[PDB]
Amino acid sequence: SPEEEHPVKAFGWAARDQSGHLSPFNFSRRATGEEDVRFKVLYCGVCHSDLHSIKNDWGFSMYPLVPGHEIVGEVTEVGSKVKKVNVGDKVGVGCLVGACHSCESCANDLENYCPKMILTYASIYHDGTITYGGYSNHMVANERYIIRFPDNMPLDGGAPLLCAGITVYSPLKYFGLDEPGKHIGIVGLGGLGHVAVKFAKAFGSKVTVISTSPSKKEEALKNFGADSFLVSRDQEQMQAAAGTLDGIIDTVSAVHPLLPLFGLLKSHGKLILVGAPEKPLELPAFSLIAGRKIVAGSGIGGMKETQEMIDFAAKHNITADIEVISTDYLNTAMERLAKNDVRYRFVIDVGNTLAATKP
């Protein structure tokens, strides 16, 4: 049973089937190994991936499932061989908790592209046990997967950077879209989306937000500093912005038309997909052939870059626009997320509200 699997008792909220209903769940975590860092969870951002997972949208879900991979907390214990962290330090854990550490990808700081990468939740750890996420009281992870939180970085506002942040920061850098002056488009002004605008602006790029929500126009332009706001619903407005973007970061969580997006790209432009739709997208061959355009994918980021990303965010005072919620509000929050009703990221105040939900 989950409660007896490991020596240290743990408590959190989990889903038991694809209805995705979350409720109190008792389990356990391994003892602190020599290279392990144990910490009390203070905050955990809510990623749409969490929603996809509890609902089994991708079909890769095993239950019971404890989601959450934008975890921030305070160190309570460290193994005898830990070097970069001390008890009391503020740390975080993203989407990864392990990898093989013996392949070219891992050697090149790309644990995220390791064929044996281990996800923070819904995966199998090196000890053969299921991984449980951040919607819980405490966490333990190997030092290589521990992110050191900057002193000038709010614990709640910076939590989403652990997944949303690195996921958009990584491709902007890798695909050479972080050049000042370049025109970058962001599709879907949601969790990853609004954070992507912030990073793009910090890199000095001109940003165009492509959205299905006219109500987000003022916030996109006046608060996030987007240079242009396009409603994908408006074919008229889209055509007027034809061939204006050097690259696009698409964060849409559902199947959506790609044709219009390629139209916004300049010759040789790049469309980067980071959203994880449940089903395949439509790709018009002509959209790529005419202008030698590219469509690529990107997943989170390696551990080294994740730390570099949070260090950059702290220097540029970048944080997510969050709505802090109590643990018992999780099911309502999940429905609001499904209905595009959050501006722009939910963050669970685990440290102050989880304990009270114990039956």
Ligand X SMILES: NC(=O)c1ccc[n+]([C@@H]2O[C@H](COP(=O)([O-])OP(=O)(O)OC[C@H]3O[C@@H](n4cnc5c(N)ncnc54)[C@H](OP(=O)(O)O)[C@@H]3O)[C@@H](O)[C@H]2O)c1
The binding site for Zn(2+) comprises 47, 69, 100, 103, 106, 114, 163
H or E element that contains 266 = strand 265-273
d(CA 106, CA 101): 5
The Cβ-side half-sphere exposure at 139, using a 13 Å CA radius, reads 38
CB 248 within 8 A of CB 270: yes
Q: Hey, CA dihedral for 331, 166, 273, 107, is it positive or negative?
A: negative
**Per CB under 6 A, which of residues 53..112 are in contact with ligand X?**
none
Q: Among 251, 29, 3, 9, which Cα is nearest to 127's?
A: 29
- Minimum gap (Å) between residue 243 Cβ and a copy of itself: 8
Q: Which is nearer to ligand X, 78 or 318 (CB)?
A: 318
Question: Angle 164-174/303-315 helices, nearest 10 degrees?
Answer: 100
Q: Which of 104, 151, 289, 358: binder of ligand X (CB under 6 A)?
A: 289
Q: Which of 283, 332, 335, 341: binder of a copy of itself (CB under 8 A)?
A: 283
**Does 48 interact with ligand X (rule: CB under 6 A)?**
yes
**Does 52 interact with ligand X (rule: CB under 6 A)?**
yes
Q: Which of 8, 130, 288, 338: binder of a copy of itself (CB under 8 A)?
A: 288
Tell me the site size for ligand X, rule CB under 6 A: 30
- The residue range among 151-159, 207-215, 228-236, 287-295 that interacts with a copy of itself, by the rule CB under 8 A, is 287-295
The CA-CA-CA angle for residues 345, 275, 16, to 5°, reads 70
- Minimum gap (Å) between residue 321 Cβ and a copy of itself: 25
Which residues, other chains included, contact 132 with Cβ-Cβ below 8 Å and sequence gap of 6+? 2, 10, 12, 14, 27, 29, 66, 121
- Minimum gap (Å) between residue 44 Cβ and a copy of itself: 23
**Does 47 interact with Zn ion (rule: CB under 5 A)?**
yes
**Does 291 interact with ligand X (rule: CB under 6 A)?**
no
**Does 241 interact with a copy of itself (rule: CB under 8 A)?**
no
**Does 297 interact with a copy of itself (rule: CB under 8 A)?**
yes
Tell me the site size for a copy of itself, rule CB under 8 A: 34
- The residue range among 15-23, 51-59, 113-121, 123-131 that interacts with Zn ion, by the rule CB under 5 A, is 113-121
How long is the chain?
359
Q: Which is nearer to Zn ion, 143 or 228 (CB)?
A: 143
Q: Which is nearer to Zn ion, 168 or 314 (CB)?
A: 168
Q: Hey, CA dihedral for 220, 222, 228, 229, is it positive or negative?
A: positive
DSSP assigned state of 332: H
The CA-CA-CA angle for residues 16, 19, 22, to 5°, reads 55
d(CA 276, CA 282): 14
d(CA 259, CA 273): 14
Using CB under 6 A as the criterion, which residues of the chain lie in contact with ligand X when the complex forms? 47-49, 52, 163-164, 167, 188-193, 211-213, 216, 251-254, 256, 274-276, 289, 299-300, 337, 340
Q: Which residues bind a copy of itself (CB under 8 A)?
A: 58, 105, 113, 115, 174, 258-259, 267-268, 273-277, 280-299
